[PDB]
Structures are given as C-alpha cells and as structure tokens.
Automatic annotation (TrEMBL):
PROSITE patterns: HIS_ACID_PHOSPHAT_1. Pfam families: His_Phos_2. It comes from the Bacteria. It comes from Klebsiella pneumoniae. The gene is phyK. Coiled coil: none annotated. This is 3-phytase. One of its GO terms (molecular function) is sugar-phosphatase activity. Disulfide bonds join 74-105, 165-171, 359-368. It is an enzyme of class 3 (hydrolase).
Length: 395
C-alpha cells in the first residue's frame, strides 16, 4: 500500500429540508402566493433527505473501511465522533450518515444541550460575533455597485420570475432594487437578492427532494438544468453574506480552527473520523477562510448542496513516512439526489479537490505536504475569533 489514510475531518451540510419558517414567509410574500407544504415540517430533514444522506454515508463507510481507516463491523469510540448542530435537521442528518456508514450499529451522535453550539451558532458567543458597523462596511464594500450586480444577473432573475410568478399577478420582490440592509441585530442582507436566493434554495431543495413538478414550481421547472440556471442568484447572495471575508473570519474561524486541529496529529478526541454536521452557512464560511472555491458540474460556483461535505484527510506515504493533507468538497448532482441514486462507477459523487503549489497527484487523490497545507488553509483565520473548543461535548 503506497498511501495510508490516517484521519478524516468532515463538515457535512444538513440534508434536504423544506424551506425554513422564515424562508417560507419571505418567499410567499415575495411571490404573492403560497408554496407547497411538504410532508416534512418546515426546517426539518425530509425522509427523502435522510435517504440521500444514508446513501452517501453507506458509500463513505465502505470507502473508509476499504482504506483501512475504519475497523470492520461496528465502530468504537476510537473509530468516529459525530457532532451535530442541535437543530433537528442536522441531528437527523448526523444520524443518517452513521446509519449508512455503520449498518445496524445504533451509532450515537452528539449535540449541544441548548440551541447554540459554539462551532456553529457562532453569532451567539462574544468571541465569535460580527461587529454591526464592520459587517456593514464589509458587505457594502464587496457588493460595490449593486445595480450593476442586478443587471448582470438579469437573465437569471428572469428565469426565476418565469418559474415562481403568476402571469398578470404582481410579483413584488422582482421590483425592489438591491440595497444592503441591516436589521437591529446587525444581520446584513441584500434587499431582493436575499429572498430570491431563498427562493432558489427552496426550488433546488424541492427538485432534490423529488417533489412532484406540480408542487415544485407549478409545473414550470421540469428538468435539472432549470435549477442549475437559477443557482447564480444563490451564489451571488453567498458572495455578499457568508463568503464576505470579514463575516467568515468572525463567525467561521472557530470552526475552521477546530477542523484543522482535528486533522492534526495528537488531536483530541483520538478518533479516525471526526464528523461535523452543520449548515451551508458554516461550510461557506470555512471554505472562504480556506480560500477554497469550487464549481461542481450542474451547480454554480461555491454551491453547497444538501448532504454535501468539505473533507480533510491526513494521509501518510508508505515509503518516506511523510504526512499529506487532502482537501475536497463533495456532493451529489441534482438528478442523483432526486433519484436517490446510490453513488457508484456510473454515477459517481461529484468532487473537487483543493490544491496549491507543492501538492502532488497520487492514486488516492491530490495530496499536499501537511504543514504547508495546514499553514495555507489557516492564513485567513482571525485568532481572537478562534477560541479553543472542547470537541467532545458532554452527555
């Protein structure tokens, strides 16, 4: 064996959800019409979502056993530690991953006893909140000419409008020019764009969910390519929120730091696989701190599909004993999620590997000298916003 996988650190997004309660209200207001009520409650992991996540977890359990990272059979405390954001959907997604990865092993997952995890709900902690003033300057600065940004996305805005608006009946959201706004809590948002993004996320999830076409966008969206054509609005909103460097630094540093320290030797806990299950906003902030941009086929730049994940693998050369870090983002394509396609040779997981000068191509993927990789991924971390977190939760 030329290469030995030593440690996995993984940050999964929650699986397929219906829109959140807030999303629903914004998007129904924005389109002057009610949207499909799913058989899943708003914000929770759909069963289809669980199915899709189980399928990824099953392949991943098989993959990592074959690579000798994981023991055969049921895992121990040394095999894996799963830590999920306390929301229902992330817990359920955590359960679904280990459900697939360790068939019948009743593997426990862990989450904070309250509603805030310092790794995830980072805006609930002193060290890891944005300063409103700074946040506004930073968003306004990346945004620049917002009228110019709206014009550039005009075609995509139109496709969204053709999909979600009734002819003859008003569609207010498409009429409001794009401004940076800031709520009393200091959350910034782009008027019009944000809610359009929310709409687009809901359509994508509806597609992925295997909703009937009649309940997705009233018959208007019939093929995966139509979802793909709408995703640049979602990319736009991410560019002006979660992937604004400053926001990523204040709210995402603690997570990236916990992730890099987790892939480091002598890590605590002593586990072969540290699986963190949280939200798209969290993945977005981390990859932005990693300065890791991806574009998977069928998706737009930076897109974070349901049940997707950012992975850090520490590998070891069998000859030299030198250590390498492999970093990638993985997801399933739109139709694959819709079809509950089990990933395999003819329908592989979509994947893009991070790279920098120094990395090398190997049988097991792009591998980057460890210390140079850890240093590079970490440059952008704000140390004061990266407190140490005990990775093993209580209870």
């Amino acid at each position: 064996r030329d290469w030995q996988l030593e440690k996995v650190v993984e940050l999964s997004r929650a699986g397929i959800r219906p829109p959140t309660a807030g999303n629903r209200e914004a998007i129904e207001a924005a389109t002057g019409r009610p949207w499909t009520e799913w058989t899943t409650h708003d914000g929770e992991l759909t069963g289809h979502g669980y199915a899709a996540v189980v399928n990824k977890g099953r392949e991943e359990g098989q993959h990592y056993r074959q690579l000798g990272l994981l023991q055969a059979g049921c895992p121990t405390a040394e095999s894996i530690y799963v830590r999920a954001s306390p929301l229902q959907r992330t817990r359920a997604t955590a359960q679904a991953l280990v459900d697939g990865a360790f068939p019948g092993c009743g593997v426990a997952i862990h989450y904070a006893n309250g509603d805030a995890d310092p790794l995830f709900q980072t805006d609930k902690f002193a060290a890891t909140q944005t300063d409103p003033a700074r946040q506004l300057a930073a968003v306004k600065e990346k945004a620049g000419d917002l009228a110019q940004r709206r014009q550039a996305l005009a075609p995509t805005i139109q496709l969204l409008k053709q999909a979600v608006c009734q002819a003859d009946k008003p569609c207010p959201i498409f009429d409001t020019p794009w401004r940076v706004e800031q709520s009393k809590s200091g959350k910034t948002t782009i008027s019009g764009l944000s809610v359009m993004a929310n709409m687009v996320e809901t359509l994508r999830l509806g597609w992925s969910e295997n909703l009937p076409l009649s309940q997705l966008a009233w018959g208007k969206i019939a093929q995966a390519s139509q979802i793909t054509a709408l995703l640049p609005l979602l990319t736009e909103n991410y560019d002006l929120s979660n992937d604004v460097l400053y926001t990523a630094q204040k709210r995402g540093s603690v997570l990236l730091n916990a992730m890099l320290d987790g892939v480091k030797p002598e890590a605590s806990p002593n586990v072969r696989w540290l699986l963190l299950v949280a939200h798209d906003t969290n993945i977005a902030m981390v990859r932005t701190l990693m300065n890791f941009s991806w574009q998977l086929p069928g998706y737009s730049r930076g897109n974070i599909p349901p049940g997707s994940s950012l992975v850090l693998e520490r590998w070891r050369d069998a000859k030299s004993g030198e250590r390498y870090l492999r970093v990638y983002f993985q997801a399933q394509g739109l139709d694959d999620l819709r079809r509950l396609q089990t990933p395999d040779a003819q329908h592989p997981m979509l994947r893009q590997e991070w790279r920098q000068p120094g990395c090398r191509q190997t049988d097991v993927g792009t591998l980057c000298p460890f210390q140079a990789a850890i240093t590079a991924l970490g440059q952008r971390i704000d140390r004061p916003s990266a407190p140490a977190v005990a990775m093993v939760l209580p209870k």
